[PDB]
Amino acid sequence: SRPGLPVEYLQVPSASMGRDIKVQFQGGGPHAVYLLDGLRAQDDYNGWDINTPAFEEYYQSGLSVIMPVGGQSSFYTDWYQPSQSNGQNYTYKWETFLTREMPAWLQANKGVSPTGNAAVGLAMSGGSALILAAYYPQQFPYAASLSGFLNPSEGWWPTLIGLAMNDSGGYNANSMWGPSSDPAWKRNDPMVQIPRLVANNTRIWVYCGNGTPSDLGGDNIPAKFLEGLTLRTNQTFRDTYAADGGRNGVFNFPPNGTHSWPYWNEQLVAMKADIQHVLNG
Ligand SMILES: OC[C@H]1O[C@H](O)[C@@H](O)[C@@H](O)[C@@H]1O
């Protein structure tokens, strides 16, 4: 990162996962932007730090920046069981980590507020961000989804998500939310949870690109299909939000936008003033 940036790397114990979770962190205010990674999340650095100047862009913004590290194919959710076939030796509990363990550690050690924050996700974690806002409104009054999979329980989505998770580290969607008919699928479906976002008055920022090249993952899915379905589902989400009385959203579907880190970063920059005004202001 740019010289002079007070960027830290932390080891935050997760009791629920029985291991330490690495977290990249920049201070600068009591409230924070949680920057969530995609399907191919690595164990060294969060994709936002690898691919974008996020820390530099939010330096001296009055907001802290939190980039959890790890959780390949996790959907930032609490799984039913260890991923069956790839030999995972514990159960992912990333919702517990993000909503309890991590904010408790950051509050106790640094004074970061557990409440009044923003969740910003892309691709895999676009839906995660909205789900976090749906069920933890005090923690996340603001959520952004950038090229997110916003109707994971519908139609071919469980199949596509299963394919993409397998293509990213051999993870099993069935171990995560059960068979596609299990209640966990709808529970974690932003489209289904729109009325929670409306009643919570969540400030939502929803971007979606189209075409190629793509950083969505799921490269094992026939060319162009995931990229187009992601757009169509985002458009349906947009229409449904309005139909359900939603009145606190920004929807950015620029025709030249792609599902790629450069556009996701452009959106992160574009929403900065928006987050500042909503969270601080
Ligand atoms: O996400 C934050 C959670 O953990 C914090 O430690 C609690 O103080 C509370 O603010 C919340 O239950």
UniProtKB/Swiss-Prot annotation:
- Give the UniProt keywords, A-Z: Acyltransferase, Secreted, Signal, Transferase
Q: Which reaction does it catalyse?
A: an acyl-CoA + a 1,2-diacyl-sn-glycerol = a triacyl-sn-glycerol + CoA; 2 alpha,alpha'-trehalose 6-mycolate = alpha,alpha'-trehalose 6,6'-bismycolate + alpha,alpha-trehalose
Keyword Methyltransferase listed? The answer is no
Asked if Secreted is a keyword of the record, the answer is: yes
Q: Where is this region: Fibronectin-binding?
A: 55-65
Residues in coiled coil = none
Locate the residues binding substrate: 39-40, 123, 151, 229-232, 236, 259-261
The compartments listed are:
Secreted
Q: Which GO terms describe its biological process?
A: glycolipid biosynthetic process; lipid transport; mycolate cell wall layer assembly; response to antibiotic
Q: What are its GO cellular component terms? A: extracellular region; membrane; peptidoglycan-based cell wall
Activity regulation annotation text = Inhibited by 6-azido-6-deoxy-alpha,alpha-trehalose (ADT).
Q: Which residues cross the membrane?
A: none
User: What EC number(s) does its UniProt record assign?
Assistant: 2.3.1.122, 2.3.1.20
Please tell me which top-level EC class this enzyme sits in: transferase
Molecular function via GO: acyltransferase activity, transferring groups other than amino-acyl groups; diacylglycerol O-acyltransferase activity; trehalose O-mycolyltransferase activity; zymogen binding
Assembly and interactions?
Homodimer.
Q: Other remarks on record?
A: Was identified as a high-confidence drug target.
Q: Tell me, what does this protein do in biology?
A: The antigen 85 proteins (FbpA, FbpB, FbpC) are responsible for the high affinity of mycobacteria to fibronectin, a large adhesive glycoprotein, which facilitates the attachment of M.tuberculosis to murine alveolar macrophages (AMs). They also help to maintain the integrity of the cell wall by catalyzing the transfer of mycolic acids to cell wall arabinogalactan and through the synthesis of alpha,alpha-trehalose dimycolate (TDM, cord factor).
Record-given protein name: Diacylglycerol acyltransferase/mycolyltransferase Ag85C
The organism named in the record is Mycobacterium tuberculosis (strain ATCC 25618 / H37Rv)
Taxonomic lineage from the root: Bacteria, Bacillati, Actinomycetota, Actinomycetes, Mycobacteriales
